[PDB]
Amino acid sequence: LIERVRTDLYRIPLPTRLTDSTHGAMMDFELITVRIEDSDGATGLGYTYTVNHGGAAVATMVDKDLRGCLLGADAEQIEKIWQSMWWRLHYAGRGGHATSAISAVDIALWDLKGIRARTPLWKLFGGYDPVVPVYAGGIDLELPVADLKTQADRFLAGGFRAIKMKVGRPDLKEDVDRVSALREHLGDSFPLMVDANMKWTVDGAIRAARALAPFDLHWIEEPTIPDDLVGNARIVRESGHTIAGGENLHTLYDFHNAVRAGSLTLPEPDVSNIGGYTTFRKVAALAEANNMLLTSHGVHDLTVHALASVPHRTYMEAHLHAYMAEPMAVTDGCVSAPDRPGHGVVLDFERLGRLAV
Amino acid sequence: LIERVRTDLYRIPLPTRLTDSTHGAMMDFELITVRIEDSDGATGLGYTYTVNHGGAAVATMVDKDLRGCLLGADAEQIEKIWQSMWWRLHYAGRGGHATSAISAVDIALWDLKGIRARTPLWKLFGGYDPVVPVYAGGIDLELPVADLKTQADRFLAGGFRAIKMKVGRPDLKEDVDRVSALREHLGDSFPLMVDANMKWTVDGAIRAARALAPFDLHWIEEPTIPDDLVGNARIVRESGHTIAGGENLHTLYDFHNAVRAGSLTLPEPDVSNIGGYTTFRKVAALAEANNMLLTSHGVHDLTVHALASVPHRTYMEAHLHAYMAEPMAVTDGCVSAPDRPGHGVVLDFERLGRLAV
Amino acid sequence: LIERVRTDLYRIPLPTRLTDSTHGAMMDFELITVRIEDSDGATGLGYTYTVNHGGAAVATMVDKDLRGCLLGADAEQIEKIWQSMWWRLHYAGRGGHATSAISAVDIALWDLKGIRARTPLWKLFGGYDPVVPVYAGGIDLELPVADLKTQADRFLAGGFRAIKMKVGRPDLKEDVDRVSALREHLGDSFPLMVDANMKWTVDGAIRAARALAPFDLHWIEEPTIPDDLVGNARIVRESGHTIAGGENLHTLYDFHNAVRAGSLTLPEPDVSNIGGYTTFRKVAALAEANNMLLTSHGVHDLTVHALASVPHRTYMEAHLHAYMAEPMAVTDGCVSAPDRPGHGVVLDFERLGRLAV
Amino acid sequence: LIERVRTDLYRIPLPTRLTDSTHGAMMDFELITVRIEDSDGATGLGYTYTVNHGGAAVATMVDKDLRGCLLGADAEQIEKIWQSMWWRLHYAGRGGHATSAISAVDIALWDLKGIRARTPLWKLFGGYDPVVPVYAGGIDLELPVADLKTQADRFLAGGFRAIKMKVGRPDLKEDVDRVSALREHLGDSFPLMVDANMKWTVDGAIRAARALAPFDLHWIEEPTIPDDLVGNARIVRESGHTIAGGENLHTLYDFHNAVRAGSLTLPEPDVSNIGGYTTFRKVAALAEANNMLLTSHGVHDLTVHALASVPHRTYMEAHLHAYMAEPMAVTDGCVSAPDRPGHGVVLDFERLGRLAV
Amino acid sequence: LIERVRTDLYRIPLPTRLTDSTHGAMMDFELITVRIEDSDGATGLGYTYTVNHGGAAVATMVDKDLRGCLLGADAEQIEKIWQSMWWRLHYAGRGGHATSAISAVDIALWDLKGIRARTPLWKLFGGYDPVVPVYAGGIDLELPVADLKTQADRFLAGGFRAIKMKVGRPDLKEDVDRVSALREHLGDSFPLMVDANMKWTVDGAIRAARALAPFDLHWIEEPTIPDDLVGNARIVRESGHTIAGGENLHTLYDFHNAVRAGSLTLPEPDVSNIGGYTTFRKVAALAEANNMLLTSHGVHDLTVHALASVPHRTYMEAHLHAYMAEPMAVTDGCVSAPDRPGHGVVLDFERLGRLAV
Numbered sequence A, B, C, D, E: 001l002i003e004r005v006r007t008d009l010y011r012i013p014l015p016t017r018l019t020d021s022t023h024g025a026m027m028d029f030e031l032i033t034v035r036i037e038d039s040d041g042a043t044g045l046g047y048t049y050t051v052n053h054g055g056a057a058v059a060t061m062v063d064k065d066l067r068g069c070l071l072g073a074d075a076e077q078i079e080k081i082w083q084s085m086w087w088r089l090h091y092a093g094r095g096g097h098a099t100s101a102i103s104a105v106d107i108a109l110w111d112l113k114g115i116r117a118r119t120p121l122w123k124l125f126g127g128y129d130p131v132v133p134v135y136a137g138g139i140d141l142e143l144p145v146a147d148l149k150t151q152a153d154r155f156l157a158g159g160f161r162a163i164k165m166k167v168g169r170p171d172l173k174e175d176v177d178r179v180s181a182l183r184e185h186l187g188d189s190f191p192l193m194v195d196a197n198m199k200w201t202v203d204g205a206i207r208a209a210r211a212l213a214p215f216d217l218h219w220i221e222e223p224t225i226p227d228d229l230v231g232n233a234r235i236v237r238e239s240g241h242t243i244a245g246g247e248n249l250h251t252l253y254d255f256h257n258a259v260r261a262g263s264l265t266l267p268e269p270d271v272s273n274i275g276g277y278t279t280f281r282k283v284a285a286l287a288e289a290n291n292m293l294l295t296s297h298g299v300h301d302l303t304v305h306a307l308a309s310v311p312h313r314t315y316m317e318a319h320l321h322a323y324m325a326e327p328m329a330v331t332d333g334c335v336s337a338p339d340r341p342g343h344g345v346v347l348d349f350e351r352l353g354r355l356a357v
Ligand SMILES: [Mg+2]
Pocket: A195, A197, A221, A222, A247, A297
């Protein structure tokens, strides 16, 4: 039984003005943490985030809407609780910010079950390989070419052996020069992927694909908006590239629609908005049945457990490490999921209070 | 230019007995009102609502996330404001409660543009016919048959010449009897429609359609969950009934998916969650293009102007009046869009004040 | 209420040299103007046109077939009037010249509603951005290469930063050279588009696309006849170009067919033949739903308000000004929708009087 | 680490000569048990079965082929071990008896992880509801009508509130009489399903569907052979019944093909041949994404844990209970998954030695 | 009538160096031989094999599960025996190793029918051309480039005029160089084919095809896993190569699925796992109907009769001879089906005796 539910909202400012083709200027993201305590004193940690806005909304959803489905409920019945939450925020929801709220709670619940069973999540899930390959995702669209190469250098220095840069400049010519620059800087066999962050039109995306073909990019992420199934399927049929998407899909059905329609070739769910580990693994299954690999977006410290428990995973995005007790370190291109009970992530809530809103 | 944005949340208490198949019992809905004031001092009224939960979150999005797109902006550029609000709440959004927040703002912006043009919105939208036909939607699933008939007479007494009743009782035999009763009670020629509120499985919905076919129901609403395009299309090919849906669809794309796949035969958008008049009208256009009629869900006071401006509308659902000054009356099965500037809705903020949270 | 409807036909003389691939040489277009007056004395201006023939017939439909739906009718119910005119000319109609007649009336009705609301139409439609980007469409197929470049400079001189040229010369080798010349002349970064005016066969259009791909054309317009849904869709899958079309589509259904089949990638409706603003806006909604941009054909003076009210517009074609009072100027590649009540177009009926037939 | 792997084969004779439309005469099924012991003394139990033949083959596969992938391996990495097993028996396998062998081992591995974590599997998986609805499946095709009704009586007496009888007699007339008899014996609202065990041709199956329509059967199982995707999809489109299948599908891909093709409406995997709990949950996810319910075939004492951890489960088949320590009892139509660590199934291996082959 | 059925298992030791992308290193294959004797004393020889594992299980199915369908049965009714063996091993079978067991029996039954008719099988099947063209399939992935060329010359030295090499090295750059080398080495006009053994992902396979296109490979075999119909069909539309597959398909239905979906362009059945000659011929018929050529995998000694009896055969794979009496020789790129009664294969059971397990 759940006896306590603490929801907290923090505004974590960023070290650099990270920027892209649509989200604009990221100067601070909103962190929402959820701590669930059972009748035995154990406390599971869960959390999600937004960029610039929507944070207070998510936190309010957990604190005012979901709480009533948690207090007094058996915390070991996660699937049961998930459905009850899905239905509580269904009216006017069924997607949107409500899924982020749910994801945070869901993550907390699994953390709790992992602690109780005295075993890491990647094992609780079944367990494949705790060593997960990674890549660094820069939010460098406005970063000058030279600064691009520099950042590239630090990523390498930091153990990363695969990099993703932003694209979607007004003039495709500028993207072609920058991508060309890093392909020469990084070298022929270096895994380099791009993310247009929904910036292109269907025709534009395909046009950009022909132009970037020479550089053998590992993949193109979110060429256009995610909602257009027909357009994305067209971009898949015509761009001769791996098409990654999923960070903006928020339900199992969105992934199901995309996969069935073939509007993406590489599923990229975000455990913190897809519905937690619960829905993430379901999406993972969908991918496996469709003979596709599986990558991820955000909170890799939490995500490492999911990918360590699936056989078809590939380069995980591992761009808050300051507030963490023992954050994972990247070695020769990979990370290792810890073996502590649960997900093993511990946040310095004392130092965080400094940033509460 | 916009100089003021006032957001208020109200807990309107709902009588017992209001129940359906999946949401459970309607305790109380939460009204999120948005009043906008521009340089010249005119104010526009817009509002949305939720059943049971999510209200505080809706209000939070407007007051905290959207206000920044309103204050200081030219209120005459509704479309511009619409797109900027869609993008401000896009991360973790792109659907969900955020579209309800957006609708509220949109609706108030149109009201303001109408107030300024000194014309009712139905005329400002184009102008078809201000006399819109209606029906009464009962939230009566757990309502004893006898009472159901009593409710029927009360609706006829109120001027309604079309009635919808809930279905989806655990055992199909119960729905058949109740439906037979009202059919028997109203006479076969009286438009009777049923709402399942997503209660049935695909097979179950098809199985229920065979069972109800004898009664010649005008339509079956939300036979199963809305997310299932394939399943809902199967229900369309096999049930021999008009299939209504759309109250739970929250983007123009959802409607595009549903229509393109033929997963429904009659689009039922809700102006207060679909994106306000702005998006509602774009959905109406899709329905016209596809040779479909157009119905609606909720806040008929605001919606009347929408359907009074499109040629293919049909029975509007018109089940909060105590708080209004000049609520439309139901006469001979129709209502009439008032000709006052804007949508013509006036709320008693004094009496509502007593219910703020 | 409508009390007057004045229909006039004018033979505006067109200079030699204006030529394309299938229509031959532009001798003179025929302007059909419709001025409507209501009870209060306000007048609304609407108009359409044809190239070479059909003018007298267009005028005849309005003056003889439609006047009966106008005189005595409430001019504020545009949508109602629209549907009744569609049906009055439905037998042997349902498309064709009759939609041009209908557009003329529709356009004047909107102008009247704008005049009455004391607001420019772009704001009355919603309001996005009054600064609409443009391009110059040359009717220059038989124009010597040299002259073609001279025409180019004249367009830059006029403020245009995007240019369309005709293609479809009997021998593909001619189109390639000419296109290479202007590409060479304008610089690769300058938006250059080509219009074939339905000249090519399906195979030929695909064959021409391979040939022109080197020049990175912004788009290819009407590669073959518009009636061929299957063929046009094949051109879309195989040509690697943005495919523009719609000037010859005369109903919302035509646009629905084309979009649903993906027989074009960029809808190009003509407000004066598609059904006026009423239908134009419904087509815009289809384009938005399908994640497509929206361009246009003809009478940019009237069209500017349409595209200035939709979020996905793109370069508007803005090639009759001598007869206008305050014609928009082209500045830095854009034009600006005037803020005068209605569409703001004023014609010199004195000077036009000299050309009546 | 796995230190021991014991494979045993038993011929469990049946209490009655159970019979059906294709498998013929079942006088004894082959039980294959697998006991995996780790470096801590814990022992996980896993098992599968065949009917009449194939037993020695499966056992041989575990003992001679899979053992080498088990001895010395970390037993906590189940996903890792599954893939290695899938690949070890891939050549000439990739389906078939190899999946049964793998399922037995897989089940053992999860049992082991459940014991180690001191928690029942239905909870380890996430946990939905330990109370799972059930139905009794008779292998009564040759059973006289009177004996049919009698058996029906014992099932009721035994707590079952849903029954499945065999169909697929040479003359559809005999099936229609028997089904008619039990529908009258059991009553109108009694859940009665049929299983043709692949006996009908596509046309025959559809013909039989029309004939059995009057009796409102809960579902028709395996109308034709499972391999025919096109034919089954046709039976689904035309029989107006829930179509259950899956017991003969042996890989995630088979289920994926069926679901995508719509050749079945209710997935029915058998945890003991699909690949264990590992693949069973993946199939479960596929079903959830496709808005389908989920049922099962065989070994319900093991299966109860899977269905207790999914939200979309329905009537579980719960037709060896003699050799079990504390077999579950059916109460008012449902069973309850035990809370002992692992799956909680304990076999009397001493008494079983009596039946070893 | 059948009076004897002798099943033997042999561990034939395989040299080091034999390696591919997914199976790893070929240690040793397991030969399962089946000798059948009828009333008149004639004996028919049939056999199958596995790589590394599954052998003992194959033998067990024949010896224990199938013998009951052979002894006492009329050996002249091959089709009858075929269907009864398919059904005896259907539970938990319907594919997998069981089809290999069935093939062994089937092959021996045909041999016996040929021995009795005193005619080679190729003539008994119809009779097309006994001179079947061939190619050499190297199991050479980890083989140094230099050695690869050396292997090439050895194949030319052996009479082969077509060569297949393995691909799927972790880094695509390695496959390109090696392929370039052999292309360079053999001359562009020499048929060179590559086998990936299911190593690539759908995107990867398409990416590899672009890379290898310069070399004009005769075909690409098993680009990804065979179970993925959708993915394999995508590889077909996008790779511009002949796509070979079928060695891992174990039923006529698998081939039907693949063909119907166009998930491969060239069917490659293996007579020893597809179901023997009986099923092999039915697969050939599907290939003829679909205007496809037909190739093969494994035991060319037995297969030669199949392809020598069909009109659309192409290069047969002809990489166990030491154990044969009169092994066909490779001359000028072809082999010739012997005209001895049956398949004409004779094994040295003395020398094989030394390898039984
Ligand atoms: Mg991204």
